Amino acid sequence: MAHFKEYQVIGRRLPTESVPEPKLFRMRIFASNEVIAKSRYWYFLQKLHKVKKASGEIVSINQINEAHPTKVKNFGVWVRYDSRSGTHNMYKEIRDVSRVAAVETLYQDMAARHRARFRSIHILKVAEIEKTADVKRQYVKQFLTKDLKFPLPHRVQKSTKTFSYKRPSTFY
Amino acid sequence: GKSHGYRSRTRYMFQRDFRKHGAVHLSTYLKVYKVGDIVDIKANGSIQKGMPHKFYQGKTGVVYNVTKSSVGVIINKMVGNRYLEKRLNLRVEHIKHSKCRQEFLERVKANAAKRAEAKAQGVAVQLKRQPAQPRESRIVSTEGNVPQTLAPVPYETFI
Amino acid sequence: GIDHTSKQHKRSGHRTAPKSDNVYLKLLVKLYTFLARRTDAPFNKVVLKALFLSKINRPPVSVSRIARALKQEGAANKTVVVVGTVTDDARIFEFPKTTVAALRFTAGARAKIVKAGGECITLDQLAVRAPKGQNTLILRGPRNSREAVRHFGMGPHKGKAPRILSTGRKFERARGRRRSKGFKV
Amino acid sequence: YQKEYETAERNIIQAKRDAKAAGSYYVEAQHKLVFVVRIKGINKIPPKP
Amino acid sequence: AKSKNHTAHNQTRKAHRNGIKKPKTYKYPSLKGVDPKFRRNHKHALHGTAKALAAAKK
Amino acid sequence: QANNFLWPFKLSNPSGGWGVPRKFKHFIQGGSFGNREEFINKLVKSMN
RNA sequence: GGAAUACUGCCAGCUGGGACUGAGGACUGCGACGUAAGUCAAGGAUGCUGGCAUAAUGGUUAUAUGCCGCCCGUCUUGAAA
RNA sequence: AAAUAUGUAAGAAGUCCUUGUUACUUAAUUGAACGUGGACAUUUGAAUGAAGAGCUUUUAGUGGGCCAUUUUUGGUAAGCAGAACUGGCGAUGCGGGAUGAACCGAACGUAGAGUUAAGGUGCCGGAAUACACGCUCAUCAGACACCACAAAAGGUGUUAG
RNA sequence: GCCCUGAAAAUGGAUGGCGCUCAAGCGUGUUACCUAUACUCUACCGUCAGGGUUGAUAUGAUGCCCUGACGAGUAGGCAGG
RNA sequence: GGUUGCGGCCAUAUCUACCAGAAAGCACCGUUUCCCGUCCGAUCAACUGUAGUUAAGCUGGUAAGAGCCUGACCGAGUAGUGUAGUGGGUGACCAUACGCGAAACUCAGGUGCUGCAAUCU
Secondary structure, three states: OOOOEEEEEEEEEOOOOOOOOOOEEEEEEEEOOHHHHHHHHHHHHHOOOOOOOOOEEEEEEEEOOOOOOOOOEEEEEEEEEEOOOOEEEEEEEEEEOOHHHHHHHHHHHHHHHHOOOHHHEEEEEEEEOOOOOOOOOHHHHHHHOOOOOOOOOOOOOOOOOOOOOOOOOOOO | OOOOOOOOOOOOOOOOOOOOOOOOOOHHHHOOOOOOOEEEEOOOOOOOOOOOOHHHOOOEEEEEEEOOOEEEEEEEEEOOOEEEEEEEEEEHHHEEEOHHHHHHHHHHHHHHHHHHHHHOOOOOOOOOOOOOOOOOOEEEOOOOOOOEEOOOOOOOOOO | OOOOOOOOOOOOOOOOOOOOOOHHHHHHHHHHHHHHHHOOOHHHHHHHHHOOOOHHHOOOEEHHHHHHHOOOOOOOOOEEEEEEEEEOOOOOOOOOOOEEEEEEEOHHHHHHHHHOOOEEEOHHHHHHHOOOOOOEEEOOOOHHHOHHHHHOOOOOOOOOOOOOOOOOOOOOOOOEEOOOOOOEO | OHHHHHHHHHHHHHHHHHHHHHOOEEEOOOOOOOOOOOOOOOOOOOOOO | OOOOOOOOOOHHHHHOOOOEOOOOOOOOOOOOOOOHHHHHHHHHHHHHHHHHHHHOOO | OHHHHOOOOOOOOOOOOOOOOOOOOOHHHOOOOOOOHHHHHHHHHHHO
């Protein structure tokens, strides 16, 4: 829950003489360190298969780096979450350079707008959106128009000293 | 006012097991008891004589006496900040050899034996139990078991 | 802080020196703590400690009691050591030879021992002869034979002696002492 | 001991690369040892812990 | 005035200052409450085996 | 026997801090307490 | 295809600045560097220079300034009340 | 039919072989007890710790308690009355919660240097008017556990779904 | 979700106060920084423990010396003064 | 393998219905002088093993059979629960972290095992 890395977690049920070689399951988990990621792996597995980590084991844990960490992409994000009064699915879009960058703004946004802390959200799917205008959401489409430019009116420069011998301007 | 008779609070404790009321099978009368045996006490409420008071239900002690129809049992009971030694005269219907003293004796034999084959080979033994150990490295293969990847699931009502 | 598991600043519960101010005893002590320190020899360590004991814990050892110990197989020639006083006992007739080292002899005990051709030694004298306690027999009086201890642990069914000041039927023999008068003990 | 260590560690590293190479996963031995530091002070503690 | 009626509060703290130890175990324990005939015969058994042990010392 | 011969290590408070706003939650929950696995080295090094 | 860099970790790798301390009082110990005699940072500071005399400095005391500080004794679960 | 709690065991006072005693017991030298003599000590029978273990006498104060989390009974409720386990206050300062018996942190010889906890860092006041993405405009905004309250119900305010 | 209505009490007044509106507000993330009688290292006082030492050799053997650990306190117990 | 006597565990053994059973056994079955018991030789007692029969008992088979038993990543890692936070929420209550973990449900399989002694195509 912080500056996110994304991990492959791969686990399985412990072998039995009856079933050596039990099936392997993978999740992609966003977390900040690997102790959290494996926790998170088990949290989800327990809600999906009978297994507690006391009957299972983690076979591999590997960080998945962004393939094109400077191509700008538009991501579709699918999320399940709890409100003070129920639980909701929700599709949002995020424009960024990496999943890991996108996911982090997802979490800030769920916090800002819906007052959803991390314990309350599940990431359902995160996906680069291939064709522009499969993009559904205005506030990301806006950036997709041709020869896009804008000013940044009213610039405030931070001052290094407490007094200034001239009245400042906001001119950019 | 309040009420604290001898069998107070015992409605579920002295009750017979579901579909197990009635005559007590003869095995109970065929067990033999020796001074120094370890028995577990558990009341049979169908036999009202020779009956442990309810504090002793579920407790295990040592046989200190053997009689026509009962064994005497020594229980150590805590009263205050100190155990007091208590002796009970239970009829046999209410008593049962402690099964763990049996594993124990079995292991003592097993132990003597392991020691024997070890000496009559002149090798080291290692006779005491270790607890469950951490787990050694493995290589899991992927032949036929390419990992299936799962994701969390959307909320939904089933009502 | 510290989660203490045991009382802090607890003092060993043991005498470290005699409570007495008898110069001579201190000297026997001064002797034995040299001996105890400077030799191996369990004996002096024992004799050292026994010098610190209070009077109740040095009950007297009697001369018949020495007679008896001397009848142990292989004991007849040992020199018997009493870190305390030896008392006479008109009850043995034949008393044997030996050498008794003690803190004190009553007059009859010296007599008895001497008359039979034996010898009375003090502890420093025993030290020179036996710096390591060689061939000694340490003896101890019956400590629980004391009148005080009859009344310890007094209670219902304990079998003890009341602290009564005056005795007979008519003193603490009725209700609670016999089935016919209330209960019994 | 420098050697012991140096080659155990190296061993484990190569184990992993070989599994990967075989399309397998090396899974490391579970830890036999931990260091524990108490980080709560000493008041208000429940008897069992 | 009414006052408090009962509580165990503090009682285990108190029992555990000096407390609990355990039984006081001996080899050769109290023959208290053991079958009188049996004991009476055990006597004779023990006397006899003592006798013989001494008989094997001439 | 070896380990017991070693007295309990007396560490200082960590130099550089605990790195979390609150120690008494789990490491998984934002920090201090519980098994932080390999990350014990960094913590102990700053305490030692 | 061949690199680089980041990140994380290791070095019994080399170095700069600042701060507090300097207990002990012949010698005994473990070592290090030397071909060697010797040397040393190896079971707790030394060396060089300077400053002060109706003084440097220290104790006390009064007052100011910063922060802090409710009335004791009692009974009481609870008293500045 | 759980979870938490709960009894016993994990050996020298043990194991095995031989064969002694009795008035008990058996059809019966058969058992039952207790023994002689012989054999087996490296891990002798899981873990972790042990700041030493065991024991005796004697005597002070107390015998109004109260609080918090959790379980819980009476009551519309109560800063009400009454139980359960633990931890506290009482008997206790210190740092934080402005304040405050009981919360958080942490328990206390006299001091120096360093580091932190809980809590904070516009100014009062030691410490970024730090960095980052949003959201919010209240002719009654809001601002931090215990804690110093707010609900049903409504809004074509604005946000995201 | 935030915000607005629903939202009435008595001396004048309290997010602690000032005041704050792309906050000094609400949700979330990341660093740095401040600070307890706590933790780490060192000196000193005491308490407890373990150890050495009058072997002939000036002045304390209930002494001298070495070492480790520890220190809250009402009612109350003991000790040394 | 059958069957009988005495059993152990006490339905995988009980329940309902329909079949089938060689041999020996077991049974029903014939009798009323005797010992013995009845309102009643039905039961209980005795007598023959002689006159009869597998009808029943009894044993085994059948059954998308009632019950009982067992298994299962069937439901469900759900309900509940030990521990954690100056977590969310006006509250009711809820989420997360380290653990433990059901019942009903569903589906699959099963329907006595066995000790001693005797006897039998």
